[PDB]
Amino acid sequence: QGGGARALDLLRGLPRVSLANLKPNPGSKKPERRPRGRRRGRKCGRGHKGERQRGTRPRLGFEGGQTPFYIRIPKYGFNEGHSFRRQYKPLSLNRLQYLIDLGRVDPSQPIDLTQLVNGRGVTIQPLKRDYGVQLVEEGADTFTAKVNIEVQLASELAIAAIEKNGGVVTTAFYDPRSLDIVCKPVPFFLRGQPIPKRMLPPEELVPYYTDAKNRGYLADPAKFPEARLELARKYGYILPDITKDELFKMLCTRKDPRQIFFGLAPGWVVNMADKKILKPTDENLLKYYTS
Amino acid sequence: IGIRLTLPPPKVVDRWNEKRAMFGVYDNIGILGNFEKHPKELIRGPIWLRGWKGNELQRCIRKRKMVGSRMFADDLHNLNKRIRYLYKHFNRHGKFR
Amino acid sequence: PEPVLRKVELPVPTHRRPVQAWVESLRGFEQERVGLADLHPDVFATAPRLDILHQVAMWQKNFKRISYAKTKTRAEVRGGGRKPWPQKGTGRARHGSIRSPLWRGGGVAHGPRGPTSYYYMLPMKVRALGLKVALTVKLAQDDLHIMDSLELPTGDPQYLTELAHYRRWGDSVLLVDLTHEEMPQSIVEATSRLKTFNLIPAVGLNVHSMLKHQTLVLTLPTVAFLEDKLLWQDSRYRPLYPFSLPYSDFPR
Amino acid sequence: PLHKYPVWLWKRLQLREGICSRLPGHYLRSLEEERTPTPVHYRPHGAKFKINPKNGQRERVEDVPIPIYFPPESQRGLWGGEGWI
Amino acid sequence: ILVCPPLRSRAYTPPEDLQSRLESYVKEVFGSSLPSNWQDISLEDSRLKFNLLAHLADDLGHVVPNSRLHQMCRVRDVLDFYNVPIQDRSKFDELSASNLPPNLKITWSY
Amino acid sequence: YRARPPPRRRPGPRWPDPEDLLTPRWQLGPRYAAKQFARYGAASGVVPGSLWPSPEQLRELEAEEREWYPSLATMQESLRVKQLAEE
Amino acid sequence: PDYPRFVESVDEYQFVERLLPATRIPDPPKHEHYPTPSGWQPPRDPPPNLPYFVRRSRMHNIPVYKDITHGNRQMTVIRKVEGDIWALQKDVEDFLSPLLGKTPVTQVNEVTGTLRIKGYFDQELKAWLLEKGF
Ligand SMILES: [Mg+2]
Ligand SMILES: [Mg+2]
Ligand SMILES: [Mg+2]
Ligand SMILES: [Mg+2]
Ligand SMILES: [Mg+2]
Ligand SMILES: [Mg+2]
Ligand SMILES: [Mg+2]
Ligand SMILES: [Mg+2]
Ligand SMILES: [Mg+2]
Ligand SMILES: [Mg+2]
């Protein structure tokens, strides 16, 4: 109001703004210091002789001859095999509720890693040994939403919080190659390559996704009702019957273990220029993309 | 001595020629053009400097790996010596460690 | 008799009201005040950031600069591999080569090592905000004039000079059209023979050109084009991938 | 300045002009081909991937041939591709 | 053939009957339905603002600059704008216009 | 004056001469053709059937997957044997 | 080249258009009850008739942030302040004084339209600005 108008009407009486009367913001550009004059000349900030003035200082970490500090310490496997450990970006229910309330993530449709990246809810870097997101229990008290979310890892409390409101949470595995496709489908669709089928989890991760307690995507569906009741009793909430819900079909919507997106079988070629999808008909190709 | 006794010829400058009056045009080709083009693509010059910046050691290293196979034998030999000297200077000489 | 009114297409913040500007015509010496034009406050009435203008102006001048100056160091000067005189006995100063910086005709100790690139990129929002401040400064100083079209009655360059002097625009006037292929031939022939009256498309708008020219002239399609382009930066997601790739709702 | 073509391309550039360009087409194929000779002085890996014992990861492996010096006397006999190492 | 008219001076002096003249244009644009609080009439409509200001420009020979259009929220602001005189005299003439002392001389070699 | 025509991204696929020694080898392979088809659709002129692996390449692709990526039953059986060994 | 035959279809392309991310941030949907479970609250309509105005960020949140320099200098920044920023300083001073027991040390940047306050008052000022309806 007052400030905005005062800043422009005062500019009217001033001369024309041109390339001459411009200047940088004060304090934004330090003056350059050069070895000239009495103050900054003579030895020019280097001292009296020695390696310091002559620029022949020893390497960083050298301690004049004695065993260096970074050498006399014993080696321990703190960072050994760091590039082969799996990383998971945490996803708090506070963050998930924050995205839902602002409309960035629609709860009316199944939620996968693609939708989280679309809403800028998480930043996944497959090149940095990321393998997905882990659903953490932070803010589980104030979470109130019925969603069908799929996350690579999930804590026991976070699973209970979603299932308390009538939602469904499932855990699925994505290989590093498939993970980059899920996060940014558009850059992959411009490579002219058929959609690949995601590979099964490594032998160590098979027990996690074959157990109904972890809500694995490769687990026996017959054990899901048993596991959901135990969480309902443990944390003291009545397990809702999602069969009677109107969104039952949407909640049950799950992708195949070999499938990347919904309704896009592996082997298809997305042609965004013509808005067409190409499906191979070769018997050998069909056997490769369905096995 | 060392100072001229006559004024130099006047320096007439045309501030409204084709190059000056059209300097800065299309510098917003990306923002105003649906990001089909990039303002760094407007840059002309050496193929190892288009849309890139670095110190002298990096410029020599980048130049050698891009146009090194096209350089003359004497010019390539000088570039290799410069990289050898700059490597020793930056990584072994200086005030700070 | 038939006013030409332009409304704001994009939503306007409730706490700010749009600013007006006279719509004029180039079809006559006294064909001004064709109508009123609504200008979005965020574009033509933002804060007068003179410091932001300087960094955007300095960016355009320096980012595309390539300095080709280069001298030869003591290793590149021809010859000079031989030690001139023995280390001791001659009674003269000790030298190892005749091409050292101390010697006449030798190398340069710390000289230019071109070609050098000064390329750097300001953030996209900073460059887009530089345009808004540039547009706001022109309007606040009564140097911005809105038009409906760039059609002149004649292609005579003398007509354009007299039209600008009668309305007291200034010594230099920058004319902006929506596109390059839709520019009327009347204004193309009139400006191509002029030195201070330049014609550029909407995409060729920049802070350096606007500050160089005393008067800025815009058409109605150009104003709508600028607001659509500039206000898109104010409310947009952080880019997952460069916008040149397909998106849900880009381009508008 | 710079050359129009890289220096390593000059050998194949001289085959574009002169009497070399008039050589039979089938002969020019036999020279421009760079078929890798059968390993003699080193054991090939046999596979494209191996498991590195230290970290237990599937890493790529490549067969790098060992340079072989053939003396001029080797051109008057049949050494079977062998030569001085 | 198109001949350029002679350049118009920027000097402007507010007429004494400006308020009566302005009130006449108000009734023309906004009708005779509302003759009370005519200075409080809002110029939100683009047609009404354009008609009122264009008539004044053609009549008084002084148009409202674009830096002032947004400030014309009511006709009251329009009246105050035209009550401000404008001087187009050069600096040399303005200096000589003042009562220069006998010991002060100004030369203009331009 | 008048500004020069704006620099535009030249539309249409860019097919260099394969007989030119100054043509980079990455602009003459199938991957370059595959990327052109995805960007420009049928206007690229590339036969869409070439995007899928050839029957000779399909056999190699299956051979690699079989050796390094086992089936679910293979991994489940391996875990059971290892678990019994640990127990 | 004996390529395998293929079939081109468009009915399955509806599953591709849902994978395209959007560039523009969507406007928050209207909710029956406010504030939302996450604590977000839409700006009041009509805007308050104050000499100043603090507009929401592009993410529709209160533009109050914590700043730290030198590792020990704790600061709170109020951004996107329009109008009379000096009236906002007086209101902030009269609100934080009881909490601190002394007049807050504040810096007013007219050019950038930002108010910088020494100390952490992030959650305190966010609740305070929601009361005024910004
Ligand atoms: Mg001293
Ligand atoms: Mg000193
Ligand atoms: Mg001295
Ligand atoms: Mg010492
Ligand atoms: Mg150093
Ligand atoms: Mg030498
Ligand atoms: Mg020697
Ligand atoms: Mg020496
Ligand atoms: Mg020399
Ligand atoms: Mg900071």
GROMACS .gro file of C-alpha atoms in nm, chain A residues 271 273-274, chain F residues 9-17 26-28 31-47:
model
   32
  271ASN     CA    1   0.559  -4.270  -2.879
  273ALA     CA    2   0.516  -3.748  -3.063
  274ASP     CA    3   0.215  -3.931  -3.210
  844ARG     CA    4   1.584  -2.531  -3.289
  845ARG     CA    5   1.597  -2.660  -3.646
  846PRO     CA    6   1.301  -2.902  -3.676
  847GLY     CA    7   1.326  -3.244  -3.830
  848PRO     CA    8   1.560  -3.536  -3.763
  849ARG     CA    9   1.930  -3.474  -3.823
  850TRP     CA   10   2.081  -3.755  -4.029
  851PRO     CA   11   2.454  -3.705  -4.095
  852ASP     CA   12   2.631  -3.870  -4.385
  861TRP     CA   13   2.736  -4.221  -3.197
  862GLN     CA   14   2.519  -4.054  -3.464
  863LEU     CA   15   2.519  -4.361  -3.691
  866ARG     CA   16   2.054  -4.591  -3.045
  867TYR     CA   17   2.066  -4.260  -3.232
  868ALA     CA   18   1.786  -4.380  -3.461
  869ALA     CA   19   1.582  -4.499  -3.162
  870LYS     CA   20   1.605  -4.160  -2.992
  871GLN     CA   21   1.500  -3.982  -3.312
  872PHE     CA   22   1.184  -4.192  -3.344
  873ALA     CA   23   1.081  -4.124  -2.984
  874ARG     CA   24   1.135  -3.750  -3.027
  875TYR     CA   25   0.972  -3.708  -3.370
  876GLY     CA   26   0.743  -4.009  -3.414
  877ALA     CA   27   0.675  -4.132  -3.766
  878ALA     CA   28   0.837  -3.815  -3.903
  879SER     CA   29   1.175  -3.969  -3.815
  880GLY     CA   30   1.131  -4.230  -4.087
  881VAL     CA   31   1.275  -4.504  -3.866
  882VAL     CA   32   1.098  -4.840  -3.891
   0.00000   0.00000   0.00000
